[PDB]
Design a protein around this motif. Structure first.
Motif, short mmCIF file in Angstrom:
data_model
loop_
_atom_site.label_atom_id
_atom_site.label_comp_id
_atom_site.label_asym_id
_atom_site.label_seq_id
_atom_site.Cartn_x
_atom_site.Cartn_y
_atom_site.Cartn_z
N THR A 559 -69.63 -5.07 38.82
CA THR A 559 -69.95 -5.57 40.15
C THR A 559 -69.50 -7.03 40.27
O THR A 559 -68.31 -7.31 40.20
N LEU A 562 -66.34 -7.80 41.39
CA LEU A 562 -65.95 -6.82 42.38
C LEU A 562 -66.39 -7.31 43.76
O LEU A 562 -65.61 -7.31 44.71
N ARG A 593 -66.63 6.14 50.71
CA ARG A 593 -65.59 5.75 49.76
C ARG A 593 -64.21 6.04 50.34
O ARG A 593 -63.34 5.17 50.35
N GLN A 618 -63.22 2.39 43.24
CA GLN A 618 -64.24 1.55 42.63
C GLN A 618 -64.47 0.32 43.51
O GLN A 618 -65.61 -0.10 43.72
N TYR A 622 -67.45 0.86 45.51
CA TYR A 622 -68.44 -0.20 45.52
C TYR A 622 -68.97 -0.41 46.94
O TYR A 622 -70.17 -0.28 47.19
#
Ligand code: APC
Ligand code: MG
Ligand code: MG
Length: 829
Positions: A559, A562, A593, A618, A622
């Motif tokens: 994270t 990110l 997503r 991702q 995220y």
DNA sequence: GCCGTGCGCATTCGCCGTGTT
DNA sequence: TTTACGTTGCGCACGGC
RNA sequence: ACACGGCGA
């Protein structure tokens, strides 16, 4: 103006609009039919001169008939080759590999492909073709079969992407490169293939009798009946897909499920509901729904006209090397320069595919606009999709993109007026982007930019800026009228459609039927100081999460970093938005997503403005979870109401059988409901009747079911549940859209309407009343009837028992005071 | 028939075009 | 006949306990 | 009716 008697066209049009316009109208419908067949032929040819006749619908009616006979002759051969006490022809060898389905299909298919492509159709060529065709399968479904799902995830997800029968046979070589266990493939040799085809050439002659062998090494032909047939089927198809264009006179009023819009009485008339099965349409045959017929009629009697001044700009400014409106597709490619350089310049290809294709409609729209300029007015016939939503019939319509809507203005204007002027500034502020701030700050935007507006109005060509606004051509369209008001005053006749569009009609509708005050609050369903932007609300929430690094940010094994990538990108309402309006429709975190990835990342990637995500996945997954967390804690009642609709769909779709002796006690069945204005909806999705079977290269084909079972077609219990929610509210707004058009017209005398599902528009002088009409309708509608309780009563006593009663209770009503919507400035729709 | 290993499906609807290099 | 980095949680099925 | 690009909502 027309009663049950108008049965013979031209006579009715002329003695109504003059035979000069009666002829033009009819001339046009017929041309639409002409351009249609033209567009057909052109294609039916590019496929013919490309060995793809089997793909054209004209052959399908035949294929279906000869496909079974083949496989019914293919097998018989086998068993018969088994009766033979000795050696077997090399054909039985290099033919037992692939499915007896692919065999026949690849036969009939290929046999037609190269016998309609070139003129060198000889046994040696066709067979060699079928040989490489049959071999280009030969049961090497190493991945498709052998329980190697790697295909249905990383090998299938691509083949269906790669375009061209050339790149699928080439890109497939890629997958083959990698070992993938097993290995090696003995080539059928350029001498066994022909034979493989030979037998295939036969059996087809032995059964279908399709192809024929001359006697001029031997040429291949087609029977005078199995050749005339695909050419017959063509002519058929050709005239059932007309490129509908607007009308030069008011559309023909609708008085039944068919025959509305255009006047020419053809064999394929227009249908009121865009249904799939004729059965579905006839279901409306006798339903009494006067108010529905009136919205559609009233709405199609709206006279529109091309906006010449806006046309002038658009015509030339869209040819421009460098258009000032970064939205329009260029005339040329994206160069090519900028694993090897190509690594970054790979999207160039597909990105140009979007351009050339986006360019085609742009040119078609400009073709229609210029074609219809000068006409005192033009109309658009209207019909619905099946949930009841209204759509203009012709490709060119007041529902198209920016340039489109910009190219169109209402034909019957009126002196603008004080209010009309006010509402226009608002319009302009909206076309500009300044629409998520109270009305006063918007007028300030227009007024504080007086000069920019006049400039663009004087030399739109010379003075862009209008082209630097969200709605360039529409804004431009406004700049013009605004300048007119300056040069002429409040008595200025203005016909510019002023668009009033609801803010997330989805949640609004849910908030309405549930009296959900929190939701309504978010989606402006109550008087408020500033305009509530539910997307901004979710955008701000996501941010707090992102802003948190340690409490939510972790190390990379992550994270934190990110989140930083996003904080850098600057997450705003732009993102999460689609994710916010589809949640109550069924979209889940996995859905986000894809969405955020495709709506924000994918586009931000190939452009440079967003190249700090290091692999979109991702980085999108995220965001997907923050949007979920943030949105889930915002949209509540909605979801609850959504799940309530899913349970009814799930239950009704279900097929209950007795526990002790399971006979079917209740059969699967469609979910049915009536919209407030009297519009009946029938949602009954169906699982494909003829199971399909792919072939990797040659394409896809269906086939009559093996097990004698397909009475109805089999309702799709899955789609029935995933669609129920979205379809329901859509049918709620469509009814709301129709209810408002009728209401605005009969109570306020509005004749001009610019409708776009959850967008309501008129001329400046009537904006004030449309502003009230919509709202009054919103209120009276959800206050007069309980759409969810009425829905229940619709399937409750009807098909639903036989154990079934796990039906969650109707959601508890909120504290929202619907009547408030009347005082809500930002609600709009 | 209680709660385990598993393939499938990701929100919906409308509609045009080219299938290539 | 030369562009394509790659991915994840609820549910109805055929089922040995 | 299943696939690619786009537009619309
Ligand atoms: N992807 C989608 N899936 C389902 N329904 C959709 C949809 N896109 C649009 N609809 C419906 O069509 C209506 C009009 O679409 P949009 O104008 O794009 C939405 P909006 O909610 O006004 O967002 P905005 O603030 O970004 O303009 C929506 O409010 C919704 O009811
Ligand atoms: Mg909207
Ligand atoms: Mg809208």
């Amino acid at each position: 103006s027309d009663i049950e008697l108008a049965a013979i066209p031209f006579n009715t049009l002329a003695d109504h609009y003059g035979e000069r316009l009666a002829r033009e109208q009819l001339a046009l419908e017929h041309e639409s039919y002409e351009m249609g067949e033209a567009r057909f032929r052109k294609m039916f040819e590019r496929q013919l001169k490309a060995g793809e006749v089997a793909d054209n619908a004209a052959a399908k009616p035949l294929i279906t008939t000869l496909l079974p006979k083949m496989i019914a002759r293919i097998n018989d051969w086998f068993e018969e080759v088994k009766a033979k006490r000795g050696k077997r022809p090399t054909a039985f060898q290099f033919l037992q590999e692939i499915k007896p389905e692919a065999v026949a299909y690849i036969t009939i298919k290929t046999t037609l492909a190269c016998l309609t492509s070139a003129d060198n159709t000889t046994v040696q060529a066709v067979a060699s073709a079928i040989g490489r065709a049959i071999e280009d399968e030969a049961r090497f479904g190493r991945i498709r079969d052998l329980e190697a799902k790697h295909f249905k995830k990383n090998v299938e997800e691509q083949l269906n992407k790669r375009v061209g029968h050339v790149y699928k046979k080439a890109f497939m070589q890629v997958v083959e490169a990698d070992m993938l266990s097993k290995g090696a493939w003995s080539s059928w040799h350029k001498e066994d293939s022909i034979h493989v085809g030979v037998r295939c050439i036969e059996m087809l002659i032995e059964s279908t009798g399709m192809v024929s062998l001359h006697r001029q090494s031997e040429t291949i032909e087609l029977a005078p009946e199995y050749a005339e047939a695909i050419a017959t089927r063509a002519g058929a198809l050709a005239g059932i897909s007309p490129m509908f264009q607007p009308c030069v006179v008011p559309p023909k009023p609708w008085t039944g499920i068919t025959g509305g819009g255009y006047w020419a009485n053809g064999r394929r008339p227009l249908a009121l509901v865009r249904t799939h099965s004729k059965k579905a349409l006839m279901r409306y045959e006798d339903v009494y729904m006067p108010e529905v017929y009136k919205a559609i009629n009233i709405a199609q009697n709206t006279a529109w006209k091309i906006n010449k001044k806006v046309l002038a700009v658009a015509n030339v400014i869209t040819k421009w090397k460098h258009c000032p409106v970064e939205d329009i597709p260029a005339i040329e490619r994206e160069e090519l320069p900028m694993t090897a350089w190509k690594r970054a310049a790979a999207a160039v290809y597909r990105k140009d595919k979007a351009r050339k294709s986006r360019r085609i409609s742009l040119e078609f729209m400009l073709e229609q606009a210029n074609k219809f300029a000068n006409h005192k007015a033009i109309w658009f016939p209207y019909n619905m999709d099946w949930r009841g939503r209204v759509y203009a019939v012709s490709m060119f319509n007041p529902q198209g993109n920016d340039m489109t809507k910009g190219l169109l203005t209402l034909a019957k204007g009126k002196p603008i007026g004080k209010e009309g002027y006010y509402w226009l500034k608002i319009h302009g502020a909206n076309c500009a982007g300044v629409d998520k701030v109270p009305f006063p700050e918007r007028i300030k935007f227009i007024e504080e930019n007086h000069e920019n507006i006049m400039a663009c109005a004087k030399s739109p060509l010379e003075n862009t800026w209008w082209a630097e606004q969200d709605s360039p051509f529409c804004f431009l369209a406004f700049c013009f009228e605004y300048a007119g008001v300056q040069h002429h005053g409040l008595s200025y006749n203005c016909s510019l459609p002023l668009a009033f569009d609801g803010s997330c009609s989805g949640i609004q509708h849910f908030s309405a039927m549930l009296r959900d005050e929190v939701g309504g609050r978010a989606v402006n369903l109550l008087p408020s100081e500033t305009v509530q932007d539910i997307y901004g609300i979710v955008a701000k929430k996501v941010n707090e999460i992102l802003q948190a690094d340690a409490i939510n940010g972790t190390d990379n094994e992550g994270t934190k970093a990110l989140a930083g990538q996003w904080l850098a990108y600057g997450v705003t309402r732009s993102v999460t938005k689609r994710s916010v309006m589809t949640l109550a429709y069924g979209s889940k975190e996995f859905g986000f997503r894809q969405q955020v990835l495709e709506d924000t990342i994918q586009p931000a990637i190939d452009s440079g403005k967003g190249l700090m995500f290091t692999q979109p996945n991702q980085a999108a997954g995220y965001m997907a979870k923050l949007i979920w967390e943030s949105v889930s804690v915002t949209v509540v009642a909605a979801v609850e109401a959504m799940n309530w609709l899913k349970s009814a769909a799930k239950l009704l779709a279900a097929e209950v059988k007795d526990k002790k002796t399971g006979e079917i006690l209740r059969k699967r069945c469609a979910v049915h409901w009536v919209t407030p204005d009297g519009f009946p909806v029938w949602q009954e999705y169906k699982k494909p009747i003829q199971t399909r079977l792919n072939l990797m290269f040659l394409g896809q084909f269906r086939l009559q079911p093996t097990i004698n079972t397909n009475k109805d077609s089999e309702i799709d219990a899955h789609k029935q549940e995933s669609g129920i929610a979205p379809n329901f509210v859509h049918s709620q707004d469509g009814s709301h859209l129709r209810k408002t058009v009728v209401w605005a017209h009969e109570k306020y005398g509005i004749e001009s309407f610019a409708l776009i599902h959850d967008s309501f528009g008129t001329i400046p002088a009537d904006a004030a009343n449309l502003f009230k009409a919509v709202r009054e309708t919103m209120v009276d509608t959800y206050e007069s009837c309980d759409v969810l309780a009425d829905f229940y009563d619709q399937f409750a006593d009807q098909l639903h028992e036989s154990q079934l009663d796990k039906m969650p209770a109707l959601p508890a009503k909120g504290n929202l005071n619907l009547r408030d919507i009347l005082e809500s400035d930002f609600a709009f729709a």
